[PDB]
Write a protein that binds this ligand. Sequence first.
Ligand SMILES: Cc1cc(C#N)cc(C)c1Oc1nc(NC2CCN(Cc3ccc(S(N)(=O)=O)cc3)CC2)nc2ccsc12
Ligand SMILES: [Mg+2]
Ligand code: NA
Lengths: 414, 556
Amino acid sequence: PIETVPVKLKPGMDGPKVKQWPLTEEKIKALVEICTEMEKEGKISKIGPENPYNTPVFAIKKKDSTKWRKLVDFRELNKRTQDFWEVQLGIPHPAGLKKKKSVTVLDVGDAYFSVPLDEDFRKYTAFTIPSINNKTPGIRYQYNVLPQGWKGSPAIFQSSMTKILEPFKKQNPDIVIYQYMDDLYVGSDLEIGQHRTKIEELRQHLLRWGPPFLWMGYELHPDKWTVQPIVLPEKDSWTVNDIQKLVGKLNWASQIYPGIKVRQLSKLLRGTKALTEVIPLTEEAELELAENREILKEPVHGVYYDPSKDLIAEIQKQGQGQWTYQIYQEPFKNLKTGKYARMRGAHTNDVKQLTEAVQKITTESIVIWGKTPKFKLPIQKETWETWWTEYWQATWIPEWEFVNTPPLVKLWYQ
Amino acid sequence: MVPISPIETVPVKLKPGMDGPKVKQWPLTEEKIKALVEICTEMEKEGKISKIGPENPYNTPVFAIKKKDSTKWRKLVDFRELNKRTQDFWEVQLGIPHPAGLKKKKSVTVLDVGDAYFSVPLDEDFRKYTAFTIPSINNETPGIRYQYNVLPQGWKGSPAIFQSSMTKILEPFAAQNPDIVIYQYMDDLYVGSDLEIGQHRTKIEELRQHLLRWGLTTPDKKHQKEPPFLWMGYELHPDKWTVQPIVLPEKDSWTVNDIQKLVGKLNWASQIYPGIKVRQLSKLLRGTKALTEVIPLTEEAELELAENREILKEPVHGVYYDPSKDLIAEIQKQGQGQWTYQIYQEPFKNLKTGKYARMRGAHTNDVKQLTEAVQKITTESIVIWGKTPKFKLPIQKETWETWWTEYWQATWIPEWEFVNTPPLVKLWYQLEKEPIVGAETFYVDGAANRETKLGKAGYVTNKGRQKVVPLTNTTNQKTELQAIYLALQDSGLEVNIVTDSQYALGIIQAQPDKSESELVNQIIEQLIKKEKVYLAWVPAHKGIGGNEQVDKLVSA
Ligand SMILES: Cc1cc(C#N)cc(C)c1Oc1nc(NC2CCN(Cc3ccc(S(N)(=O)=O)cc3)CC2)nc2ccsc12
Ligand SMILES: [Mg+2]
Ligand code: NA
């Protein structure tokens, strides 16, 4: 890779000046070893004080391996980097990926280190390995090549990648390959046995046409991804409390579905009755409940993905290891809902479960739409920002905001 | 001539679009002009500056200043303008080490590097921007024009470029001498080691040996300053550390700037003096910005100050860090949203102390504050020691498990153990998850007229108990809370309450144990006294009996 691609920031925007956050000694030592080798390989270089920019860095362990990986938080640089139309006006997101029976995710970020970064842009990739307790000046570097996690790296590399994939694509016309940041998503409908080998067939391709983590494979089955429609209880005896909760749920659902009615069911709650008193359903209330049940079977109307708007992901803690979430662009027009349980690690660690939920939801968002949602997280900012990097295992990072007032609607997805 | 390596130049630029400075040189007295010509002649002989021609269009004013018992004139180049137009730099000297993160060193030498400073050349392409002019006597000849060849004192980039140039020069020496530590800040180079003093004095020599290869002359820091080192407000002693003496001024009249300075000192002091409190004192400077405004001290601020004075009577000291021992952090609740903590490795030998104050807010509870304190100490400990300490917290393991499993947010506290030191943090009420059999059911509601501010609040129950209370100067939200309060007041130890108030649910589901709203506080006091409370929400105006009835009773 000889010629660099001219890269620039957006009009009237300077480079990132983001504070490095404190790192544990073990992550510093890991980054020191990593960056020493990258510097020997020419991928990064020491910079002097005339470079004022900075992007935070930390270290992670990808899912199911013991070697530290450097992770740069390029979120600020990414949003300040010019919008990219690599060689064409845009690679249409493949609507077919979300339908494949199996999708495997490959870390191909290491391929980026073979392309030089435009020399005029390098200063904007500055980062700091901090010392403990400010005992020594942080170690200052910038990238000489396409960095993992930067928006422009897949863009600039897209020409080189399409060529590597051509012979494989030419041979397997029904396999769907989609590239998002440092990752490749490879979906087939065939047996996992041949799927796997077929996956390895594609690794060798990148191995002959060229990795510390290329051996790994994150396996997904989006054809088995299950949604969460709105369900109403089926009971033989309703207490006053049961009906109160039902009318509340139906009233909330009426903002989503037209023609939900609660008149007949509210009729049952005539008088000032004890909450535990059993109320027989009339025939009018049962019909109304049946008509509501029917309405709720059908999907929401006029829900369409608008590629110009952000995706918003809300998450609720339901307790006992269970989490519900909804993805939408306008309120009450959910594009996707879901529910998780028994998060791999952390039967006793809420924040680790939430971090894993965020990663799984972001992965679903990439498959379905090719971009990451903005999260509304049920957690105090200070708790989240102290701990999430300890459980992070993806090479991208979405945006997030914090919910400080308890939503009343948690109980509706319950 | 022993060849010396050149110090690599740092390339420098002005901010984009901006040009160099063009500030007129003031008039100077004949005496000052003579003085400046002598100084600059010497500086030119030493290579620091050079005469330039008239084509250079830039200029920075120069001044002459006199001192008390140094009857010298001293030079002064006012680079204020040039700094405004100079690019930003990486300033590598933001934070300083905290003493509690340092390890003991048998021997410490301090070298002077103010002289090596001038060996750092200034980027050639940038020198033109540093031009200045000595006016001539009687303005009868052209002013003498000079520019800098070295980092000018007072120029924006000199600290960072100098610090960076030294670090680079030192890099190989530090890496090939893992048994010493080197710290630089300003014109001082601090070298420490656990070697015997003789064998340490030799490392020092080798360092001079190393430094000279860039032609850097560096002798001991003149009048080597007996322990402790007065550094960044600390007293670094060989075996202990503290803040420099903290003396709280005695006064009858306390003013805005006094209380600011008083909190400054107390905050500085709280990193080693345990149990410092600053809420009531900090309280008194809520919004005033006239530092001359006098403020009376609440009797709760005098008691707090007198409490601080007692803690300041005898000096306290911290110990240095031992990486082979555990790191432990212990927190106490002090009241009024205040928290204090100690970090130590052995009991009774604090590395440092600290405090935490609750965030501004209408409603809050002790467990949420304790969690915030834990996060603050975690992050401070990562900074200072590169690791999380083990926590000792005044909360029962069972309390915490009940809190986090039932709290609507994700929450986490790292490895910790209970320490039975009152007051203990506890949960003060827990709402039922299901309606209570045999408990009376209160349907509550309230409403207020937006124009007149007249309201009503009350309830109707399944046993026919009823109450409506007329209210003045109220609001919908207040009447909704008042209604729940009335139901709590008038019910037995177990009660089911039905409200349509999304506002009230939002407060109560946050599980406050204390509020700035007297009304919420009164509700909390009632919840504490109950044995069981189930709170149910229903949507307003849906014909939900009981709710409908009481909505009518209160909507006048
Ligand atoms: C060397 C140094 C000096 C100062 C000052 N002002 C500040 C910093 C941050 C320094 O930098 C480092 N200091 C240390 N530890 C400390 C431990 C405590 N003492 C005080 C002392 C010791 C011995 C004598 S004595 N008996 O020689 O008179 C007198 C005073 C100083 C060194 N560790 C590191 C690790 C990386 S940098 C660095
Ligand atoms: Mg009402
Ligand atoms: Na209390």
